């Protein structure tokens, strides 16, 4: 028969799962962790949660489950269900939902030395405070914090995995099992053991194993699908300075329509970023700037229309203003005779009034051109500056700026 | 009671609920399956799923749970928790989520003759394929397939539940009118039940309960069809406005954008299958294409109205059609100083001659535009009325068959 039968019966007989396998009082179990990332499933910005598919490798040394191989026909390795063994309650402390433990309770590999090797897979949803100051060019700094839910530093000593005699200080990524997210590219993946010095060696929160994921958003999709249409639409405000300043020119129509388009784009952006209030996203700042510029241009269109459509009846054309805006910036015979004279006089007055209207139109055109040259420059400078400072947001060269180490295999 | 406890101890001394009760090897277990629909909760068209609150009336015979009532002070029947007795693994095979088994585990009722009865309540998400040809004037045909997940036709025989009197088999879903909640959006036309086999799989037999349910389309009518009718009315009207008004594009484009928004928002409530296009979406596309053609023809009319002899010369065929033939059919018929003074008067007279001639030709162009506009008005009114009436008459004549075919 399968010789593992009597071996497992002997091992699991007289074995209390609820007892830590401390050989003596001062013995501390050296629990060893190692994370393997198979897929960065998603990063929910609105909920601020990173969803990952990771195998967690936990190694320890339970002295109770050891045997002499020659006694069991050279059996040097068995599999025991994890629900039957003592386990270090290594849990993800910073989960967003209530999921602390692992998804699937895989078997534990037991070696005759007593070495315990547990490799359960898990879907982890871990909180990741998102810095939106440079969206959509941002890079996020997401972290996974593992700690023993039950035991403290006087019973369990969390350590990072030591491979080939050198400590594994990174989230191991197996090229055979890895599908790059496509939206987020992983730049740095360091790992380190951390201490909360506010607490003593007790309190269960003294020691942690933190795995960091410095991920960078690929901006091409956001650039093409949001930023480029927004810039193209916001570049239309400067066109209102070439439409005629009269009925049917439709300066105000174009200006207000571009304002409404920018409002719609602001609403669209509001759906793509978290509702945190620590900073304004870069695209949000650009949208606020262009909406303010378009409002100023609406005011300018109203002013230009009011200037151009003035008449001598309502307003008087001062000579100072005219010089400023046109000199520096740019029986029956008697009745018939009386009737003819009146006709000539009326025609002369009408022509003079038309000329005054034309002068007002010319002043309006001059103001219009000067304001166009101001507004085009303002819009171009704002757009170029904002998206240049967006493009110049690099991921730090080192995983920790204080440290000089790369944390790569 | 003491005697009930003694009887329970006697019955379950060696009873193993993991063993199908067969007195002789090869005997089958007759299982009667019936459905009671307390409430048809939801028909989610988006995910093609039907959520229902049901009682799954099951009944079989267990020769092991047999006793003499006279030996236990006349205990006719018992209520035993469903975890203690063997039950067939009757599950809903076509569920949408992973819920196969029954939500609520009520006690079974064991008669002294071994007849076990079970009435477990459940909330089932059954997957239902949706025919979107006539949405929202449509009737759906949603099935609920029940069968034993483990035991095949060689171990359990599925039958139909007997009525309350226990005389005849009930071949339909039982609706208890005293404890039933009308859905309010659907009406249950037919509710037959029928056994189904498979030709290629003799070990397959299941009981399917069909729900032929007709949608009540008042909500979709009120909130989508009438506003689009008003939009189409505006799209017809745009051809009655005079080109001088300067609001033809405003009206036509506003109608186009409104109907596009209606289409976009109604795209949320329709399923995303590509087997057919719902009649409401076809109507919306018809209205949208018609309004786009209205915009194009309004642009053509505006172009015709604003021409001038200094810019265009009227072709002979346009004059032959729009000036002479159509208007009858559309009922839309219509000393040095003295020398200089005389020269000035003569020049003014010639200027007035030229102005009158130019104005007359411009009037001819504007009349061409007006006649074409009136023709467009009549044609578009006829087309819109015919199309809307045809589409909604086709939709209105869609009812579930009188024979449920099940």
């Amino acid at each position: 028969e399968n010789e593992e039968g009597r071996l497992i019966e002997k091992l699991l007989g007289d074995y209390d799962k609820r007892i830590i396998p401390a050989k003596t009082l001062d013995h501390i179990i050296d629990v060893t962790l190692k994370l393997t990332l198979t897929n960065l499933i998603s990063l929910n910005e609105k909920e601020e949660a990173l969803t990952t598919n990771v195998w967690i490798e936990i190694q320890w040394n339970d002295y109770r489950l050891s045997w002499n191989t020659s006694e069991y026909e050279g059996i040097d390795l068995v599999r025991i269900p994890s629900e039957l063994l003592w386990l270090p309650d290594v849990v993800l402390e910073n989960n967003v939902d209530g999921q602390f433990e692992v998804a699937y309770y895989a078997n534990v590999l037991v070696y005759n030395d007593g070495s315990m090797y547990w490799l359960p897979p898990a879907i982890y949803r871990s909180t990741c405070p998102i810095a939106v100051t440079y969206f959509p060019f941002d890079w996020q700094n997401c972290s996974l914090v593992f700690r023993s839910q039950t035991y403290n530093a006087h019973e369990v000593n969390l350590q990072l995995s030591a491979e080939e005699g050198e400590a594994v200080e990174w989230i191991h990524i197996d090229p055979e099992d890895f599908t790059e997210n496509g939206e987020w590219t992983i730049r740095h993946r360091p790992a380190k053991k951390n201490y909360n010095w506010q607490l003593t060696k007790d309190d269960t929160d003294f020691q942690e194993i933190i795995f960091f994921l410095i991920i960078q958003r690929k901006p091409l999709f956001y650039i093409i699908n949001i930023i480029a249409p927004c810039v193209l639409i916001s570049s239309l405000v400067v066109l209102v300075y070439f439409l005629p300043a009269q009925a049917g020119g439709q300066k105000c129509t174009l200006s207000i329509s571009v304002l409404l388009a920018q409002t719609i784009f602001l609403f669209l952006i509001a759906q793509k970023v978290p509702e945190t209030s620590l900073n304004v996203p870069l695209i949000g700042k650009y949208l606020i700037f262009v909406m303010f510029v378009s409002m100023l241009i609406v005011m300018n269109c109203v002013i230009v229309l009011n200037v151009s459509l003035r008449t001598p009846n309502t307003h008087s054309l001062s000579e100072k203003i005219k010089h400023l805006f046109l000199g520096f910036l740019p029986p029956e015979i008697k009745s018939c005779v009386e009737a003819c004279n009146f006709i000539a006089k009326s025609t002369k007055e009408q022509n003079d009034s038309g000329s005054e209207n034309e002068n007002w139109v010319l002043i309006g055109k001059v103001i219009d051109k000067a304001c166009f040259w101001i507004a085009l420059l303002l819009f171009s400078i704002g757009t170029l500056a904002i998206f240049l400072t967006g493009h110049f947001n690099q991921v730090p060269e080192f995983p920790f700026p204080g440290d000089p180490r790369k944390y790569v295999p | 009671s003491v005697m009930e406890d003694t009887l329970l101890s006697v019955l379950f001394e060696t009873y193993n609920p993991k063993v199908r009760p067969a007195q002789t090897v090869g005997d089958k277990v007759t299982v009667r399956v019936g459905l009671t629909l307390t409430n048809l909760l939801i028909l989610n068209e988006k995910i093609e799923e039907m959520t229902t609150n049901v009682f799954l009336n099951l009944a079989w015979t267990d020769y092991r749970l047999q006793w003499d009532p006279a030996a236990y002070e006349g205990i006719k029947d018992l209520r035993i928790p469903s975890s203690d007795v063997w039950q067939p693994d009757i599950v809903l095979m076509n569920n949408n989520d992973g819920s196969f088994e029954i939500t609520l585990h009520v006690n079974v009722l064991v008669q002294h003759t071994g007849a076990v009865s079970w009435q477990p309540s459940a909330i089932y998400r059954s997957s239902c394929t949706i025919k979107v040809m006539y949405f929202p004037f449509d009737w759906q045909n949603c099935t609920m397939v029940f069968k034993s997940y483990t035991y095949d036709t060689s171990e359990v025989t599925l039958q139909h539940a007997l009525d309350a009197k226990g005389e005849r088999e009930v071949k339909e879903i039982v609706i208890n009118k005293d404890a039933f909640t009308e859905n309010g959006q659907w009406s249950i036309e037919h509710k037959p039940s029928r056994k189904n086999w498979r030709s290629d799989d003799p070990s397959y037999e299941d009981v399917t309960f069909y729900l032929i349910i007709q949608r009540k389309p008042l909500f979709y009518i009120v909130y989508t069809i009438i506003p689009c009718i008003l939009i189409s009315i505006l799209a017809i009207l745009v051809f009655y406005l005079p080109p001088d008004a300067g609001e033809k594009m405003s009206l036509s484009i506003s109608a186009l954008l409104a109907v596009t928004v209606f289409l976009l928002l109604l795209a949320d409530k329709v399923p995303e299958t590509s087997l057919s296009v719902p009649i409401i979406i076809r109507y919306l596309m018809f209205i949208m294409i018609l309004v786009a053609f209205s915009v194009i023809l309004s642009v053509v009319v505006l172009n015709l109205h604003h021409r001038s002899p200094n810019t265009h010369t009227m072709p002979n065929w346009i004059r032959q059609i729009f000036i002479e033939t159509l208007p009858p059919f559309l009922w839309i018929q219509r000393p040095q100083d003295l020398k200089e003074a005389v020269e000035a008067i003569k020049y003014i007279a010639e200027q007035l001659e030229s102005a009158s001639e130019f104005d007359d030709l411009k009037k001819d162009w504007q009349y061409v535009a007006m006649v074409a506009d009136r023709l467009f008005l009549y044609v578009f009114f006829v087309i819109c009325s015919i199309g809307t009436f045809s589409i909604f008459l086709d939709a209105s004549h869609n009812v579930p068959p009188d024979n449920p075919f099940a």
Partner: protein, 388 residues
């Protein structure tokens, strides 16, 4: 059944479910694994997750569960609950949102020779490498990677039932078409442990999207507004409605871009063709708005301040209008009274000359519009003939 009760009592009296079913520890359990796709629940492109309803048929041999039928009344098959016997921990490697292993422990058939067949159901939410580059006419290939988790190839061996997953009882989705499907067994050797291979079975399905819904609901309105884009060139400038038409077309296209971006994932591996073409149509609408603003400015140009350059007159009045064949273009007190009449004549002279210059400017603007309209019509004709 009495005989079945006795048989079940005897089978599990000293049966340990922690022990592999092998006569000797060096052997391996040969497991036959087959997938049966009952239904394709969904393909979530934004989250890149494929939800499928499957049956995971597993067959193997358990020597410890054998009996002689003649001793138990002739019973040859029983249904034991799966929680009582050894089961293979078969895990979906590329799970994305669901459960890794089987969670619905149904009963399993067990013959008298030890043969065990187990058919548990499952909802697999696998991870799908969605490639939106021909959306909505795309073809998606994404897999279901299964394997024994805690056993290598020297302890538990899995082999597919058949070269293809069983789709006999497949429920047609109505949105996707099962073009192809295959199941491949993989041997993976790691540098750590070359002696022990790791076995794997990858089932892949090629889904072809049925595009009618997306066509009708997105593409046709977008095509309609793209066609209406070039209609502004036929609108006369005097009407003062070109801005309304052009800007409304732009707003409709920005709304439809909003619709597109919420339909496809935010991945940057490949730019969708629909989004790229929508961006191209937006660029066209912006160019049309700019050039029609130029046209409006030219049309309303004041003849007093602006005088027509000779080259403009030659190009747009002397040569281009002849090119268009399909166009209909044209190619005491008495002395005071006398002086007043003369002044009226002079003012009419000046008005006629200014109106002639303004008419020339309007003619140039009309020629520009007609050039652009001809270009747009040529583009439309070429596109319609080429693609359809």
């Amino acid at each position: 059944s009495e005989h079945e009760t006795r048989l079940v009592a005897n089978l599990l009296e000293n049966y340990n479910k922690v022990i592999r079913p092998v006569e000797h520890h060096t052997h391996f359990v040969d497991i036959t694994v087959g997938l049966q796709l009952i239904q394709l629940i969904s393909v979530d492109e934004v989250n890149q997750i494929v939800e499928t309803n499957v049956r995971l048929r597993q067959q193997w041999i358990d020597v410890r569960l054998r009996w002689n039928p003649a001793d138990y009344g002739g019973i040859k098959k029983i249904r034991l609950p799966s929680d009582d016997v050894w089961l293979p921990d078969l895990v979906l490697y590329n799970n994305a949102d669901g459960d890794f292993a089987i969670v619905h422990m149904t009963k399993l058939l067990l013959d008298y020779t030890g043969k065990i067949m187990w058919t548990p159901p499952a909802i697999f939410k696998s991870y799908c490498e969605i490639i939106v580059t021909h959306f909505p006419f795309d073809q998606q290939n994404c897999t279901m990677k299964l394997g024994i988790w805690t056993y290598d190839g020297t302890k538990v061996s899995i082999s597919p039932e058949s070269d293809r997953p069983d789709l006999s009882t497949f429920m047609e989705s109505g949105e996707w078409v099962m073009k192809d499907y295959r199941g491949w067994k993989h041997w993976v050797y790691y540098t750590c442990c070359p002696d022990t291979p790791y076995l794997d079975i990858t089932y892949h399905f090629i889904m072809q999207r049925i595009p009618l819904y997306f066509v009708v609901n997105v593409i046709i309105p977008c095509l309609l507004f793209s066609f209406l884009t070039g209609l502004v060139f036929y609108l006369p400038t005097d009407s003062g409605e070109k801005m309304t038409l052009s800007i409304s077309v732009l707003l409709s296209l920005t709304v439809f871009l909003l619709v597109i971006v919420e339909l496809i994932p935010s991945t940057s591996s490949a730019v969708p063709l629909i989004g790229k073409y929508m961006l191209f149509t937006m660029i066209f609408v912006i160019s049309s708005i700019i050039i029609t603003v130029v046209v409006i400015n030219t049309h309303h140009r004041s003849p007093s301040t602006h005088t027509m350059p000779q080259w403009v007159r030659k190009i747009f009045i002397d040569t281009i209008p002849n090119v268009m064949f399909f166009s209909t273009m044209k190619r005491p007190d008495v002395k005071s009274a006398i002086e007043g009449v003369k002044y009226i004549a002079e003012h009419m002279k000046s008005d006629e000359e200014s109106s002639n210059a303004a008419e020339e400017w309007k003619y140039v603007a009309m020629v520009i519009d007609h050039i652009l309209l001809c270009v747009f019509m040529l583009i439309c004709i070429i596109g319609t003939v080429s693609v359809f």
